[PDB]
């Protein structure tokens, strides 16, 4: 059976609603649904579904000449009226998409002719095309697939215009995709991809060793990192470690004792041995992170001061702040309350857990008591919505979300970043400046707003940056080189020659 391939993913791909989030998996959404405009490594975009466009001088009104020759999939036509209906379906759920500033900006969309689409924006919005390129939400499902006249409540069947079709899905066993034969673009060489649902990292490694899995592709969690390092030595396998794509950190709750105290957040930044953490937990496969964004991220080379590992500084900071060691205890007290801090994390991820124990042990040495609460993933998202954490693992999103989309999302009253930042006197200022970062057309202005925002987040110790992580590949040598997509969350199955 060339030309079919088998892979793994630790969960099912999900309902494949193009317009919702969890549990839809983004690489899958991107396999089935396509955008107006496709993101490129240079940061630019190229015509995709939209063959061309023009804009008013004031730059608020955009007219896209769609391609004429595109059909979902189930045969139905792709035309301006379908696009308009998707946008409308998206904007009915607007408050959910408020993390993405484009959502806050679309004033209306109007189908001109069969081939002309009119989007109008509240401002001349410079991140427009790149944000339209995103896996989600501005991608197109056959309107004939709504429920009522909505997508926010569910869809019927995942019909899009992409090169791949969801054939079959069996919770929690496997998802099958077949190549779309009536596809407007280039023919993918692979005709079928099967995702075996396999939640555990070691089992994923054993499954690759059996010969049944053609390709594994994913982040640091893909498989255990010591086995990956063995696999890389094996002349009968192929492996790849990309350059770093995003950052992994703790977020510290500034609106919740004791992490509401600057001194405490700084003493925590000082108390962790990051290199020891990375060589141990992460097997020296990844690199040490000092700042929310690596210096290689646009706008982010700022020379921000690293917090290097320093338990005496940490415990001096704590001391000066009134957190003191009472006769007979390990753990500091202020007005009789112990320096206790809750760290929350997906109870079943092996990496988070290992990291958590290390962090726990490192703080304990400075008189801070962290208790590990491992819990259900849905419970973790909830506390992130809620504001119900001391410290929480968290990560950035990869190009092209970093920094601009990731900063935008910090403003939206729920998720992790707004909640962790709620207790800063500085917060309304930072939210106004993020806003200005997305508004301004002058690069010199942009350079300084980014410096001011990232500098404040950094000096206020909102985060404990941990590492900069990479994509990871394990594959059969016959597939050749496996490429990386310009969007970090996509997998470019269509480029593989088996
Ligand atoms: O890129 C990411 O990890 C997240 C970006 C956005 C965030 C959300 O769930 O509100 C999404 O998930 O598309
Ligand atoms: Cl509205
Ligand atoms: Cl998030
Ligand atoms: Ni997300």
UniProtKB/Swiss-Prot annotation:
Major site of localization recorded for this protein: periplasm
Pfam families: SBP_bac_5
Cross-referenced Gene3D superfamilies: Dipeptide-binding Protein, Domain 3, Periplasmic binding protein-like II
InterPro entries: CntA-like (IPR011980), Peptide/Ni-bd (IPR030678), SBP_5 (IPR039424), SBP_5_CS (IPR023765), SBP_5_dom (IPR000914)
Keyword flag Hydrolase: no
CDD domains xrefs: PBP2_NikA
Record's GO cellular component terms: ATP-binding cassette (ABC) transporter complex, substrate-binding subunit-containing; membrane; outer membrane-bounded periplasmic space; periplasmic space
One BP annotation, GO: nickel cation transport
Keyword set, alphabetical order: Nickel, Periplasm, Signal, Transport
Protein localization: Periplasm
SUPFAM superfamilies: Periplasmic binding protein-like II
Listed GO MF terms: heme binding; metal cluster binding; nickel cation binding; peptide transmembrane transporter activity; transition metal ion binding
Keyword check for Signal: yes
Protein family (similarity comment): Belongs to the bacterial solute-binding protein 5 family.
NCBIfam families the record matches: nickel_nikA (TIGR02294)
Role: Involved in a nickel transport system, probably represents the nickel binder.
Protein name per Swiss-Prot or TrEMBL: Nickel-binding periplasmic protein
Organism: Escherichia coli (strain K12)
